Amino acid sequence: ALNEGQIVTLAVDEIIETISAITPMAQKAKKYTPPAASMQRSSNTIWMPVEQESPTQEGWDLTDKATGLLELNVAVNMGEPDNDFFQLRADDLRDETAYRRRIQSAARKLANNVELKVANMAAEMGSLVITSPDAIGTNTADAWNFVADAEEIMFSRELNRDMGTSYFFNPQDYKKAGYDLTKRDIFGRIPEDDVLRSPKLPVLTKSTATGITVSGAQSFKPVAWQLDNDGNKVNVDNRFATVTLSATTGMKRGDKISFAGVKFLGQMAKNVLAQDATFSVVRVVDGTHVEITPKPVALDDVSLSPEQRAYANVNTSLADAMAVNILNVKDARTNVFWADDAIRIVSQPIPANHELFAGMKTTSFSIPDVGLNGIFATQGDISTLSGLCRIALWYGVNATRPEAIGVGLPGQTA
């Protein structure tokens, strides 16, 4: 008993409000709108610049010193839209409340997909790994202060533009951390330190690799561009570095690794930190090759030009036979934290031709709080004697600066 316009308005309003309500993580990720918004279905590889770091320029005369600086880009592939294709039945459309219930159920699945993607990307791409044999709690003597350690490691490392980080707990560790939650939203947002809890934080399975050592002396340098097969210049994603190892058995995407001698550096000040350099493998290429999500650029590397050395983030390079420590020795449900632009959500409006083809009524909407662009379409089918309804969300989550994304792993007793 709902007319067409009423169907469209109620559905779009329900989708927008419920997705903006039940997406805590996706609202903490920076919203990126591609500069080139065109009506094309092919997914372009958007190259967003990362912050430029330059060597210290001192003195009155600076001749030919602006030139030669490196500008590096990171790539995001939006891919294909996330759809929820279902049928609208008579009981759904009998009144406004039932229709809102059905549309809420659909948009709840879409918000599931967005949050699951963000949480999994943060857990499997986060490299600022902090572990402790103890469990998270308020007991100073025997428990682990995840928030304090995360803040300390982000401050020491200087990867936070001084706007604060975002800490996400899983409900078990949020309960153990003694957060009152009575004066807080369901997620802990203080409705009208920003510590929140999410139920979609994955459990990071243990890694069984034991005897892993670096295969040979390997040094990585930030490369601005490379020639593709056509001969044109294409930027190089300077996040991931391929490391040759003795063996990669028992290594999977998301495993957090560290190297024996390699240490963090203060990102801006280039001073050696106490904490060992922690990396996350994003892909296992071969039996002897892995791909770690922050690229280890060594200060002591003499082959680096000063412009390249301005991006150094580790104490030393990888030696001939260097032990590869495994941080996720035990199964633990992840707690993640990231700073500023560590995760970006890239989305542009879905190309559509409204009111052009009779039978299909497509309405294009946008969720401003989350930064997702979508389309809502209905059509009638006689193979089901019901109105097909489709909700699409076209977005791409990118983990820009994986060095700024952290994973907290409690109870790594080993």
Binding site: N3, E4, G5, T9, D13, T363
Partner: peptide, 30 residues
């Protein structure tokens, strides 16, 4: 009071098919 009149305006906007006006009026109602 005026809540019942803005509810009628919301219903008219919804029947017309304007999502933006419906959402603005819903925010006004709350």
């Amino acid at each position: 009071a005026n809540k019942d009149a803005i509810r009628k305006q919301m219903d008219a906007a919804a029947s017309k098919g304007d999502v933006e006006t419906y959402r603005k009026l819903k925010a006004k109602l709350k």
